[PDB]
Amino acid sequence: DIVMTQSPKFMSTSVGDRVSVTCKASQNVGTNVAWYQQKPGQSPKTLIYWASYRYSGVPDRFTGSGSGTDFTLAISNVQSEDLAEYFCQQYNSYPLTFGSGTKLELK
Amino acid sequence: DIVMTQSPKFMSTSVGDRVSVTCKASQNVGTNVAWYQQKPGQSPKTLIYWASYRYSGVPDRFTGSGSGTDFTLAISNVQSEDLAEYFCQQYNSYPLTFGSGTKLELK
Amino acid sequence: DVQLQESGPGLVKPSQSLSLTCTVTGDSVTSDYAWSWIRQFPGKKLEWMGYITYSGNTIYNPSLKSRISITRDTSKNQFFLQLKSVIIEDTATYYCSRGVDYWGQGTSVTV
Amino acid sequence: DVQLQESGPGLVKPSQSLSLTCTVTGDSVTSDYAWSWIRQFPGKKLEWMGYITYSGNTIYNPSLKSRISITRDTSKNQFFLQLKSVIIEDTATYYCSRGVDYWGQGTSVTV
Amino acid sequence: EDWYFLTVLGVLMALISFTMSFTVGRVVRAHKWLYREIGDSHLLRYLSWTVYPVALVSFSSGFSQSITPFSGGSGIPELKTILSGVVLEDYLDIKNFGAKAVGLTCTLASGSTIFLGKVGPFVHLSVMIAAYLGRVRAKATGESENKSKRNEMLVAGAAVGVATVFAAPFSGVLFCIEVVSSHFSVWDYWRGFFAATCGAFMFRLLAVFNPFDLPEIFFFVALGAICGVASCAYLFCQRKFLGFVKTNPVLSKLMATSKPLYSALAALVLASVTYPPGAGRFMASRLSMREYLDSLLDHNSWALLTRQASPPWPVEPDPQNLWFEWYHPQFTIFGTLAFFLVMKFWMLILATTIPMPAGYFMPIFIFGAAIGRLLGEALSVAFPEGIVVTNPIMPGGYALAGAAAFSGAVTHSISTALLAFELTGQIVHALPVLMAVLAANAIAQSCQPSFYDGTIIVKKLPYLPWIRGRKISSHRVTVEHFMNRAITTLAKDTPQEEVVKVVTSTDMAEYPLVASTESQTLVGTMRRAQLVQALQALQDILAEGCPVEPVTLKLSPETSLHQAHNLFELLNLQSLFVTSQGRAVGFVSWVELEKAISKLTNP
Amino acid sequence: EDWYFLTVLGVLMALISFTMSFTVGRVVRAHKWLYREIGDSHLLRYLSWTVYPVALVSFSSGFSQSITPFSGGSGIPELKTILSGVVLEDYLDIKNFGAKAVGLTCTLASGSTIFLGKVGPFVHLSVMIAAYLGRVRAKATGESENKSKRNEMLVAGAAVGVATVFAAPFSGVLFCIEVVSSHFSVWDYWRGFFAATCGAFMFRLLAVFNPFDLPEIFFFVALGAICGVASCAYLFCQRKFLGFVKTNPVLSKLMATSKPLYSALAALVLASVTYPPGAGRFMASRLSMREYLDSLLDHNSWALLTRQASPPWPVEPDPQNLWFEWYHPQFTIFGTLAFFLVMKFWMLILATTIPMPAGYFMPIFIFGAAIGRLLGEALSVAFPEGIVVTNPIMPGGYALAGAAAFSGAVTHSISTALLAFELTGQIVHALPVLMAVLAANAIAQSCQPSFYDGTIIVKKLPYLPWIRGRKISSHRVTVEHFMNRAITTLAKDTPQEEVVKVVTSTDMAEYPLVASTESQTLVGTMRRAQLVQALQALQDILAEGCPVEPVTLKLSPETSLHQAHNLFELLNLQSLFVTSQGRAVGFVSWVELEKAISKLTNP
């Protein structure tokens, strides 16, 4: 299966700063990558279904970029309500593989 | 530059067991990978100059394999004198990039 | 607004087959989408199980072909798993999802 | 049995250029090989500096083109670095090596 | 000074390609900008969409009309005819040039609404340029070049043109060779290749400015067959439609009245279907011509993606993800593809019909690709895992194959496949696609004539060699029917005054030399200038010392036309004498042959 | 039943390729095993090395000799000659077949010591097979096939053979077309392509058994030029050497005495140089023929690698890293390459000379590649960083270009380049290599004849068309010299008994019909069987109802040979009548033409 490696595993930023989570795929995915948000306890709500495309009802600050093998979720103007895990997944090939994601805390 | 990622960062095995350190390159290297041994304090003596080729005077148990993007240093029958760091480097392209290597302890 | 609701037994014994019923409200199961099943371990790593097409052609994860079996009842608009040969490592929070767009709330399965 | 021996000043001040002299015994510097320089930080990460060919064509690491300058004296069979614009981050154990086959013992440089 | 000539043409062609292409890019971009900006309201937007395609096309039509009848609307067929031996002087004239390039540019700008490529026109232009070059050479140094040489030059030019449009040296020349004539020499091919290389070099210079399984193979073969079938269907429609257009008095009358007007109307009609909110979501209308191809040959497998996630409809077509245009919620991607196909077919013929400078290869290729893509998608759906080392099905490859195959079938050319491969970059799966193409060719060449051939037939151009689905009595006619029966015999027995008189009268390029006035039997030929010179300073004359050229070949009156034509083509001759029982009866040349051909065509 | 025929040949060819290749692989493997195992001692090892190459070659030679003079040692040139129109019946006969395949196999086994490819022989075999197929068809149904058809079939066979050896459908056929004849019809090409495709399919079935910068471009051009120069140098040597061999009485006498013996001696000599400890480290001797090519086209840049690390000399050549054989400590890789080049050149000519079934394309290609590789290495050394987005120099590409270019120069064929590309997989840098090839061709075609052409010249085969560096008086001769002056006139005025007598006597295929005995003027032709029939059941006879065939074409006695030859080729004729002042003087056919050609060749 096509492994989704990602970094950095943990982050700690203040309210208003920028964060950039990066995902790397072993094979070529294309642009068929989806990003999630999982607050602990709740279900993982999708944020960005294709790199550079936000889901309806999601804030504008959640930006996503990349193609080929490397992808980036960038979050600007971080609020207190964004304490959550963030997974990237691919769906070009089968089976669908998720990255382990990154736990996010704030100061 | 072409990054050499590698794993696992730390290991702890007994005398006689097998260990397998794995190096991964971003671009295609070919077979132009060299493995080292650095005992803390001393200079890093080369072990395997090309994957599947041991340097003269080195034990037979130090085996090396792989081509393309993925490479593996396998050590069988570990002795007490093999407490050392082990780096892989490539020399197909420029500049020459070293992996961070893996510190090895024993029980 | 497609909504998916899982249901089933929380506690199960190993070497006994488990089954989860996911009910759908909003869209029909007969529509052309990827009605996938996914689970999350206690260490927060996600694993994709597989899905049924609109016609019924099941597609699974190669690693779990032997044990997984997925079916549907088109009258009730539901999804049925029948995961066999259950092990303590399988203990996880299961997630019933329509492709990538919508995920269910899910149920916690314990062995 | 090619043997390489480094020598130079251990303690240096920042913004003052450092120079390390690596003497060779076993092989001539005029032979066709990659007479490379490499350094290791206190956290045990290796960085390749560059090398001189038999003719004298210097090749450097793209990241350190501005500051590095490498030369030789063919009479004595030696290697001279002249690393300029020195910073506290540059503090490392330096290593003079003939390609990949042989590495020197090296010297610890401190800023 | 052959190599130099070859070089010069190629560079020029490359330059032309660069300039025209650039213009197309700019204007198209501007149009796009306008469309987004004009506003949300439908009326204004509609106007913007419609006016631009219409107006340009009308302009092109206007440009075409006013110069000369064979100025516009002809690319390959005319060239082919010329090669076959019957030359149309109006076609090669350069007064045409200035009118045509602009028209072509306009057409290109008009783009995916009109849905026409640039190949044939480009080729024609190249040929014209070559001719011009030749003419200068003929004038500036030596004498007027032999027909054969000229033909060769033309061929080379054509090859270069074909290469240039493609951006592909190896394949383009081959394609040209296949289409443009029945037989071909190696030197010609070499020349073409050289030209292509030169063009490529020029392009490069001008950059600073700017393992398949057996099941898979089987599937590919099937796809190819399907494409061939489709191609065949298209061709018949195309030909029949053209015939209808030619016929209908209402239509014909309209055309006569206003060439521009009909074209404009056609454009309008195209726009009305091709409007983005009206029927563009279904057709994937809003894409450039290059864009469409890219979308078709995209590595992603669409159906699966759709299943996974409902894709968004962007404001402007996404440069990274072109395939989003092919999706709709109500119509599955398959449905959209189908719509594109049938609708395209309906339109494509119409587009081809309109009188303007326009190429019809690119559109066909695109059509072929679309079908292939659809097939791939279907296959993917069937086998989501794929065929069993379980490799997934890549519909891009299928699409490519389709493009290769359908186009090949249309054109009667296997080198389409090669071109496709070149475009791709990878020759890794050379076989299956090739096989498919071959199959298509087999199916299509046995049931219908080539697109070009069909067009020629519709025109009623003087092309003697056989075409499928065209009844003609060419075997029946003999040299006795079409020979120039009037001749000027000069016999060794004749007096000198008479000879002088004859010379004064006719001044024919080559007089026959006869044994005696009674017998009328040939013993050679005399040139006219030489004779005149001799006179200034017949047996007696000969004795004195005028040079006789012996008759190297003699046709009989009872020889077939076809054979004669072949002789003219292959030996590369200018004129030839006819003899019945040894007597000078006729003088055969191209003029007479051409006339005969015309007669055969047009009773 | 044309398509079927085409199919059948191709499959057979593929099968042959599979079997022979397999055999070669097995035997070679066995040999390799033996070499390692026999021991450390030099004598035994030497024997092992030497015997195997010698013995096989000797066997091959023996096989060649005993059948017929044109059985062995001829591939392409003979085929070319045949195509040109002059047919050698001994060449196409199948009694040859059984002797030749085995020889070829043996040669292949002998491998990189002997250093010979399989192309020409394979092509010949294919042609033979095609001929055989044709013969059966002729026998089983209808009548004996027309010459033209046969020629076409032969061409197709040749194309298929060329494709098969390559494992490349697109290019091989093209190459065949370029080399094998001066002109081609599009249909022949198509047929060839089809055959190639079939072969490919067969191969596939039988698997279960088993962005460059301007500086770079400039460099490539230079490389190409160099290759061309080298090619030219080679060709002259090759031709001259062959001539010398033909001449020398000592040598010639030896050859006469024992064809095998000379070959054996040559093999021995080759071995003596090509021994691994003696001079094999320097030549990279110990590699298979395929292996060598792989080594040449390896992605790694060798000099830099060497500088980095001193590479080890393995016990057996490493399957992943073939380039290790090219290194030595005392001689830098460059030096080794140089040695390989010059030494190869010295040997290559000798190898070509030895009388056996062997192809000479693959070796040439390898040679070309080597030079390219060397050049690349040099470039790398010059620019270790590379040329300025600073991309590193990849010598593999350079090597490939060299291979394409040198070979092309040797053979006079641009489709070598195409083949190279196909082999690679990638068409990404189609241009520079192509350019280089073109340059090479230009340099080589202007200074020397093609390798094949040279060989033909050496042979003194009856090939009428012009070859560079071969003085011959072909323009001077006319039809009056070589016409069959004896003929059998049947005039309308003659009696019946006389006619009957004539019929009884000659039984010529086509009698001339004449107006009267005194005049001797042609009015048509009569067939013999028909005449006989009529007699069983001349003016009177005609009246009664015997069919006259009219004379479609007439040569003059004063026409040039060249023109006649062209006519024969291009119109695809069998026989043609000669007329001086309308009289039946001669009957021209291929028999006479062939004789004339022979005379021209061999005074």
Side-chain angles (χ1 to χ4, degrees), chain E residues 388-407:
Chain E
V388 302
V389 73
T390 58
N391 60 333
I393 300 183
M394 191 165 288
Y398 275 85
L400 180 69
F406 178 92
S407 43

Side-chain angles (χ1 to χ4, degrees), chain F residues 241-252:
Chain F
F241 194 90
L242 212 57
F244 178 91
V245 172
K246 290 291 288 186
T247 315
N248 279 27
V250 174
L251 200 45
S252 181

Side-chain angles (χ1 to χ4, degrees), chain A residues 12-87:
Chain A
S12 55
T13 59
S14 67
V15 173
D17 293 15
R18 187 168 290 182
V19 191
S20 56
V21 181
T22 65
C23 276
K24 178 67 190 295
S26 58
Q27 296 190 359
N28 187 356
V29 191
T31 72
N32 305 331
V33 171
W35 293 89
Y36 297 97
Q37 166 182 115
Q38 187 161 233
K39 299 185 185 195
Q42 294 87 342
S43 60
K45 293 185 286 95
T46 186
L47 289 181
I48 282 172
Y49 34 34
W50 322 80
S52 202
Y53 282 89
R54 72 194 67 265
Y55 206 98
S56 59
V58 182
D60 301 323
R61 64 194 155 74
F62 282 102
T63 64
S65 296
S67 60
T69 55
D70 58 333
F71 304 88
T72 58
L73 179 66
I75 311 168
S76 57
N77 300 353
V78 175
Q79 300 183 0
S80 58
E81 301 182 329
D82 307 341
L83 292 163
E85 286 190 320
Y86 299 123
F87 310 94

